[PDB]
Amino acid sequence: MEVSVLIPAAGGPKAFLQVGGRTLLEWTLAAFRDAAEVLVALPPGAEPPKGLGAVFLEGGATRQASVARLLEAASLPLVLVHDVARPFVSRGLVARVLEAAQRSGAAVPVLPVPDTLMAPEGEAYGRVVPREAFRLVQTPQGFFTALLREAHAYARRKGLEASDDAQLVQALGYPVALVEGEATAFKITHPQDLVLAEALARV
Amino acid sequence: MEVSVLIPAAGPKAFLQVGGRTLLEWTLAAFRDAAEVLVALPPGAEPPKGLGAVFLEGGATRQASVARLLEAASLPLVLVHDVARPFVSRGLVARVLEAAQRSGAAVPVLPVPDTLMAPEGEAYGRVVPREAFRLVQTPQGFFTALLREAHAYARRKGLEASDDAQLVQALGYPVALVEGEATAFKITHPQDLVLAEALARV
């Protein structure tokens, strides 16, 4: 009913972090349950859970390496790549990313920067920059599978490592379109992120 | 606390409902133990009847509303807070206040949580190192006389800035940083409400 989803979850393992009666992995698998194919990377030695609708492989040392591994196994001409630390991604966000990726070949959800944006002078406080000029980049990021393969191939040759797939595609000279992200699709990174995640999980 | 709390809720937004309470009521509960609470509201907006805050007309901008509230602030320490950040814990308030008392000017900051990118057009564009940057919240805490001087000097110079720390900085006075809170996000867009009303439940 949709198409090809890559989950580079090889960062115990982050994929098995419990958030309100579902692991992170279980949360993303629910968000993409309409996808034709879900491929998940797990750290070597970590045992894939039984009976979920997904194919598992061993991830590399970096998210990027895990994506490349997953990508080789992708069977469909369109891919969504998603951070497992973003459990609360809505069906609306997915469809919006996918829809734009189908047309444009590369599409990323973004949010405006909500707060004054400041660079500490060690101290700090420090130097403020116009938050209106900047965005917070989220996932899923959507691509033609063939394009993301080209991006990863060129990155391998150049030794380019970047924090997301959009940056690899950009290095090809390929335009990456932006769509509206969502406040609920926040990344669980720090201890207070986890606590806030338990609140949204109940509803 | 002791301690003037200024809520520049002007520059209706204050009356936005989030769970059981309006945004204003969330803020008043967060600063329930402050000796003096001053709230700015848009002209024509009528204050609710038994909240124990003191109300003044706000200005055209949030900064101008803070400047108006500072006229009336009578305690030697001041916290200034965005009414659109309802979920401010007690620990956060005490962190900011404590650091204000120690150094005279302090703000809460969060790490930038996502890849930080400057669009080129409507297209992806330039990525900057997020670890070098912070998100600034609120409350911001100061010796009242310093914030008053910072506002006077800004008005004199025509300086307009997105928070109070930048005004104090323009005086050449150091501003300390403390740890913020993920829950102290600003409600700006209709989907922030989504996140808020879920947090409101607990």
Side-chain angles (χ1 to χ4, degrees):
Chain A
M1 198 224 74
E2 278 185 326
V3 270
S4 210
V5 176
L6 320 181
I7 311 299
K14 192 63 161 294
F16 307 151
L17 181 80
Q18 273 275 326
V19 180
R22 268 169 163 190
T23 66
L24 285 182
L25 176 65
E26 290 171 345
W27 286 110
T28 92
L29 293 186
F32 296 101
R33 82 176 114 221
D34 289 322
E37 177 182 67
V38 184
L39 298 159
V40 180
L42 291 177
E47 271 274 350
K50 292 298 181 305
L52 311 169
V55 169
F56 296 85
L57 349 178
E58 306 186 323
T62 59
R63 180 201 185 275
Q64 186 172 319
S66 299
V67 169
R69 292 183 188 203
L70 295 173
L71 196 48
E72 205 177 306
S75 65
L76 301 154
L78 207 83
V79 281
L80 294 168
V81 192
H82 185 67
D83 290 350
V84 80
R86 302 170 151 106
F88 310 124
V89 297
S90 64
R91 215 220 124 78
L93 187 47
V94 185
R96 182 188 314 141
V97 173
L98 186 78
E99 198 276 325
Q102 289 166 337
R103 288 171 9 240
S104 77
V108 171
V110 301
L111 285 182
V113 174
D115 301 314
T116 297
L117 184 55
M118 184 272 291
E121 178 59 46
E123 335 265 347
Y125 197 85
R127 170 187 168 246
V128 175
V129 302
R131 59 165 193 95
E132 43 273 7
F134 286 93
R135 300 302 182 277
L136 300 175
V137 182
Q138 312 185 299
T139 73
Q141 311 194 345
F143 304 98
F144 299 152
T145 311
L147 173 65
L148 193 58
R149 301 216 257 238
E150 293 292 332
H152 276 267
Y154 182 68
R156 200 170 307 123
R157 306 198 324 264
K158 303 292 281 194
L160 174 63
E161 304 179 270
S163 62
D164 70 7
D165 287 293
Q167 286 163 87
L168 303 188
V169 171
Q170 184 177 43
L172 281 178
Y174 197 97
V176 180
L178 305 183
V179 302
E180 31 169 351
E182 273 174 13
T184 51
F186 61 90
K187 184 176 203 200
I188 301 171
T189 304
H190 300 109
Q192 35 169 255
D193 297 330
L194 182 53
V195 177
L196 178 68
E198 255 113 26
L200 189 52
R202 305 180 208 269
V203 301
Chain B
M1 276 187 278
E2 185 106 13
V3 205
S4 304
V5 175
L6 328 178
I7 311 301
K13 188 45 172 280
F15 305 139
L16 181 80
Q17 285 225 284
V18 175
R21 304 157 149 183
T22 65
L23 285 182
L24 183 57
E25 287 160 24
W26 282 110
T27 282
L28 295 170
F31 296 103
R32 192 137 276 161
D33 293 310
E36 172 182 89
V37 187
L38 297 156
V39 184
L41 292 177
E46 216 79 15
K49 81 186 215 304
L51 303 180
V54 166
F55 296 88
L56 295 163
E57 292 175 34
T61 66
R62 185 204 139 272
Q63 180 178 331
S65 285
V66 178
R68 279 169 183 250
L69 300 169
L70 276 169
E71 296 290 351
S74 65
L75 294 162
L77 278 150
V78 70
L79 300 165
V80 187
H81 187 65
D82 285 335
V83 83
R85 302 186 191 270
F87 314 113
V88 167
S89 63
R90 290 179 283 276
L92 174 50
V93 181
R95 204 171 306 127
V96 172
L97 181 63
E98 165 189 47
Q101 296 167 322
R102 287 193 307 267
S103 71
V107 307
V109 297
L110 280 195
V112 171
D114 303 309
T115 300
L116 187 62
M117 183 269 294
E120 157 129 296
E122 57 175 351
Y124 197 93
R126 182 176 60 104
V127 173
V128 302
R130 66 179 172 100
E131 302 89 352
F133 288 94
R134 301 282 149 89
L135 306 172
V136 181
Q137 319 181 297
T138 268
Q140 313 199 339
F142 310 92
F143 295 147
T144 312
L146 176 64
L147 189 60
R148 203 189 295 287
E149 180 61 14
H151 277 267
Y153 181 66
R155 276 163 59 74
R156 189 174 308 138
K157 297 281 148 165
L159 173 61
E160 294 183 273
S162 59
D163 72 353
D164 291 289
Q166 287 167 87
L167 306 186
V168 164
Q169 174 178 61
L171 292 176
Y173 196 92
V175 180
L177 303 181
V178 294
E179 183 171 38
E181 297 272 346
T183 56
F185 60 87
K186 197 186 179 182
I187 302 168
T188 300
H189 300 283
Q191 79 207 339
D192 300 327
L193 265 176
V194 170
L195 203 53
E197 228 126 21
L199 187 54
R201 295 178 190 278
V202 289

